[PDB]
Amino acid sequence: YYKEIAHALFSALFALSELYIAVRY
Amino acid sequence: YYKEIAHALFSALFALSELYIAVRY
Structure with missing residues (x-):
């Protein structure tokens, strides 16, 4: 569950x- | 210049x- 929170x-x-x-550029 | 603003x-x-x-899910 928390692996999906990372990459996102x-x-x-x-x-x-x-x-x-x-x-800015 | 504005093409780079879009995709971003x-x-x-x-x-x-x-x-x-x-x-949430």
Whole structure:
């Protein structure tokens, strides 16, 4: 159950990071 | 420039959606 929380929590943070990069640069 | 904003904005929202699913279920 918690394995699914990981990959989702990290895919989210990573996706949000690319968006930040997309905005400023 | 705006093409990179799309795929990022949608990958983010999708990633956040899976996390929501991961939490409640």
